[PDB]
Design a binder for this molecule. Structure first.
Ligand SMILES: NC(=O)C1=CN([C@@H]2O[C@H](COP(=O)(O)OP(=O)(O)OC[C@H]3O[C@@H](n4cnc5c(N)ncnc54)[C@H](O)[C@@H]3O)[C@@H](O)[C@H]2O)C=CC1
Ligand SMILES: NC(=O)C1=CN([C@@H]2O[C@H](COP(=O)(O)OP(=O)(O)OC[C@H]3O[C@@H](n4cnc5c(N)ncnc54)[C@H](O)[C@@H]3O)[C@@H](O)[C@H]2O)C=CC1
Ligand SMILES: NC(=O)C1=CN([C@@H]2O[C@H](COP(=O)(O)OP(=O)(O)OC[C@H]3O[C@@H](n4cnc5c(N)ncnc54)[C@H](O)[C@@H]3O)[C@@H](O)[C@H]2O)C=CC1
Ligand SMILES: NC(=O)C1=CN([C@@H]2O[C@H](COP(=O)(O)OP(=O)(O)OC[C@H]3O[C@@H](n4cnc5c(N)ncnc54)[C@H](O)[C@@H]3O)[C@@H](O)[C@H]2O)C=CC1
Ligand SMILES: C[C@@H](O)c1ccccc1
Ligand SMILES: C[C@@H](O)c1ccccc1
Ligand SMILES: C[C@@H](O)c1ccccc1
Ligand SMILES: C[C@@H](O)c1ccccc1
Ligand SMILES: [Mg+2]
Ligand SMILES: [Mg+2]
Lengths: 251, 251, 251, 251
């Protein structure tokens, strides 16, 4: 309780899974939250499932849409006051090796996972700096920012990009005394309804050769590290990677 | 509040600085705590400064003392019930390059920083496994587990050892379903009375070429990441490194 | 001598600096080489400066040009026989923080440094696999694939992308028994005529807080690690990062 | 040929496997070599199998023996002139988890794998600095300096220690203009007669979940990266890790 008092957060892809759990715990800890998704039909229902309009609202936005980012920040500031916290969580995956990735697939994945995170990070620094907000940008990544997956070529590219791009931003903010931190979060496998719909997926992810714990995580596992990062408790943490992966990358 | 409900923690070197702040926040969040130090004179006063005997006690112990580790676990279990949480925080430094390290210096530093962490980790796994405690071993490290310092040769050795030793332990616990997680915490520079007593030290640490934030951290910066790691909020985190360094390792 | 006997290499951006030195040492060790650059005026002269047409030729190509990649592989195979070795060396830099990067700058840098490396890697796997060539793809990176630079935001993104994308490709090639390895090379600061034309640049790079050796490297420093990687001497090395940086990333 | 002209190398544990292959290729490239082992019976035969006494000799030495290190450097300088190159290759393994490691096992493994590497590194810096030798210390590590193995607890400790200790030494040498570089080499699984004597071992190591190439390496795979590191070709490489692992750590 109260760990995010006064904070105002944007969470992209906040209607499902990890992003929804981050939204839920953010509201529980006192933050006001704007969640997004490319589609409108889930959004209002997702928001209402967490809290009331004074706590959480929905804004339809595709994170690859550069001009839509300014509309999103404006709507959030209108609802809740100046934005303090950005969680760049929206992402997609292509299940292809590098060898088998089409250029269209490459460009589509990079538009969401890389351009979108760049647009959000750039705008968030501009809008959040020098306001005494204790501002925090949390760029969602994954184990795939540290290790390869033969069947996730473009996804690996995007996650490695966000990993090191975030360090650049962290350093510049720290050196300019902007009062903006930038860090990455790296989930391993997490159980969601989407994983549940893929026959065999959780079992494959839970083999000890993949996740040493012998089971995948849950959305709140990623929510709680995000609360820590969004809060002033982490005021000395910037430019770093926070891994919550059941041991996947330790072997 | 309540984030460590029911937890029972041992924190080595818990009478000063980082270890004292970890103890303080642990008590605030509902944990019972046994702090240690090689010396007795500070201990009881340090404990009483945090809370009452039902919350926190002191046990004199040099972490390099193998047999003393069993006495420490026994005393803690006597006071508070079965131990759930171990923070291996006790450490020393030698200000020497590898080239200029004497063998006595080498052996003394490794006894505390490496052997002591091994003894605590080994015993903690034995005593904490298979009890449904949500057990957590937090091995204190530093930026010096990732990067070299020309003037900290043996210290670097110790911190690199603990970094990877902790991953081994994490994996074995995860694969054996022991209900014990093992992670490392990596502070950058932190202001304490000891740093304050070293003329010029904080200023040197605060140069942008060292810490990009332009200032060093405070003990609570390390306390809060430890609360997260000791809590069930981090039940999917094992075998990982948590860095709180003001950007030091991001450049 | 003879360390690249029978090898046929493409080196993008091979007319200057690092790429020219890689070309030079490749020819010395018995490889046939096709160098590229976006511009034609330097190319033939650069090639003739290294060797004769039976050793080394030039092909004008912008690495961001997807269709031009197939023309490049065809021209090389026409000149020298099947390509065994690809060094993705072409790159550019934008001297901007993330905050100050324009979208046009972002897209231009990613087209060369990321898309271009993807196009070359994808095509090289397709054209080099299953031919008993001892094929090797060497994706040029830099220290900026490991650490941030506040003034190199998009460049950091690109270098982190190539770092982890290359691991994906490595794994898929290894698992499919393609006889193609993929590794990254990470130069620190290297003296070239271009650096020499930037007043103050080498001196700034040579400060001990940047490069511990107190001086920057030379193009042959990167050439020699590339020879090792292109050769069968490194037949068990794949998915790894090879750093030649004067100590920059060790502190 | 000639890549180590004039170099004088000490290779600890140089009578078998990886160390023998390093010795072999070092001699082939023009270096004079002193190999060691704790036992005498294999040594002279191993040396004679590589070359004549003017090329390679044997010195009986347990790398854990501190005073024996000065005798070893003296004998090498007597045979061949001033030592330029040290490969700290001697090591042992204990097949125990952290939990199950006895203190005697811990101390024995650390004496060879950590103390021994410290003694060699410290003495080598002292004896090799400021002589214009192009001096190089190559500290053998393994994949177990990057990732955990649940059954290699003390070994992981030792390998993580050497990894970061070597960076400290690298930095101090670079900052003091000592003309001594320090780097680590990280073999994955390598086929040797010892592995061949362990039923099932190579097959287990060759599973794709362990080594993506689907087979283990050979001693020359580690020899060739050591030649590069010992040579002046790598004069700008210090403080870095060189991984030759068949993809083990890329996933
Ligand atoms: N489920 C898993 O096992 C793992 C997930 N992750 C990563 O963590 C993050 C969050 O995942 P979840 O929210 O559980 O995802 P989900 O798979 O349950 O649903 C996808 C999420 O992204 C959003 N989204 C997709 N494209 C978008 C666009 N163009 N604009 C705005 N929103 C968009 C949706 O609202 C949705 O919340 C992602 O960045 C993902 O790549 C990483 C490793 C594992
Ligand atoms: N102050 C700083 O800038 C940094 C500190 N650290 C690390 O973080 C950890 C905690 O530091 P602080 O508690 O602030 O230290 P401190 O420097 O303020 O005091 C030393 C601590 O270690 C204990 N200690 C030393 N030798 C011991 C032994 N043989 N047995 C039991 N206890 C012993 C003392 O109780 C004391 O709390 C250490 O492991 C340290 O190496 C890491 C980076 C920076
Ligand atoms: N000079 C230095 O200090 C450092 C250089 N690097 C990196 O190493 C690599 C090689 O650098 P140099 O050859 O010395 O570069 P250079 O700065 O001396 O010249 C640029 C090179 O890239 C090529 N190039 C640029 N855009 C291109 C395009 N669209 N298509 C084809 N070729 C193109 C040119 O032929 C030229 O060889 C690059 O990827 C660079 O980013 C990394 C760290 C430091
Ligand atoms: N075979 C494999 O799969 C792997 C080996 N390694 C590492 O690479 C290095 C070299 O291995 P190999 O020479 O093939 O070993 P080996 O297993 O074939 O034989 C052991 C080597 O270490 C020496 N040795 C052991 N204790 C010693 C002491 N107290 N003093 C002096 N010498 C001693 C022996 O001469 C012998 O060459 C070691 O540091 C090892 O830990 C790392 C990963 C895998
Ligand atoms: C990395 C994880 O988000 C994933 C991506 C594609 C298919 C399954 C799982
Ligand atoms: C790394 C940090 O704990 C430190 C060690 C010795 C002297 C000053 C600071
Ligand atoms: C990283 C290095 O290639 C560089 C890039 C831009 C300006 C100067 C140096
Ligand atoms: C890591 C490798 O050297 C190994 C150690 C012990 C038993 C088998 C293999
Ligand atoms: Mg650094
Ligand atoms: Mg792995």
């Amino acid at each position: 309780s109260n760990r995010l008092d006064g904070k105002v957060a944007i969470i992209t892809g906040g209607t499902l899974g990890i992003g929804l759990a981050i939204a839920t715990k953010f509201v529980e800890e006192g933050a006001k939250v704007m969640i997004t998704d490319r589609h409108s039909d889930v959004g209002e229902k997702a928001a209402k499932s967490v809290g009331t309009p004074d706590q959480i609202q929905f804004f339809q936005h595709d994170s690859s849409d550069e001009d839509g980012w300014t509309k999103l920040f404006d709507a959030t500031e209108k609802a809740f006051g100046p934005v303090s916290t950005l969680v760049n969580n929206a992402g997609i995956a292509v299940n292809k090796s590098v060898e088998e990735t089409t250029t269209a697939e490459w460009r589509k994945l990079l538009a969401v996972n890389l351009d979108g995170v760049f647009f959000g990070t750039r705008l968030g620094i501009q809008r959040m700096k020098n306001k005494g907000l204790g501002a925090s940008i949390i760029n969602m990544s994954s184990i795939e920012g540290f290790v390869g997956d033969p069947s996730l070529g473009a996804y690996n590219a995007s996650k490695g990009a966000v990993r090191i791009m975030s360090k650049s931003a962290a350093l510049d903010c720290a050196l300019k005394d902007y009062d903006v931190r930038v860090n990455t979060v790296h989930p391993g496998y997490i159980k969601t309804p989407l994983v549940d719909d893929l026959p065999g997926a959780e079992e494959a992810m839970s083999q000890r050769t993949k996740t040493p714990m012998g089971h995948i995580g849950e959305p709140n596992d990623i929510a709680y590290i995000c609360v820590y990062l969004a809060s002033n408790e982490s005021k000395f943490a910037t430019g770093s990677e926070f891994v919550v992966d059941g041991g996947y990358t330790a072997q």
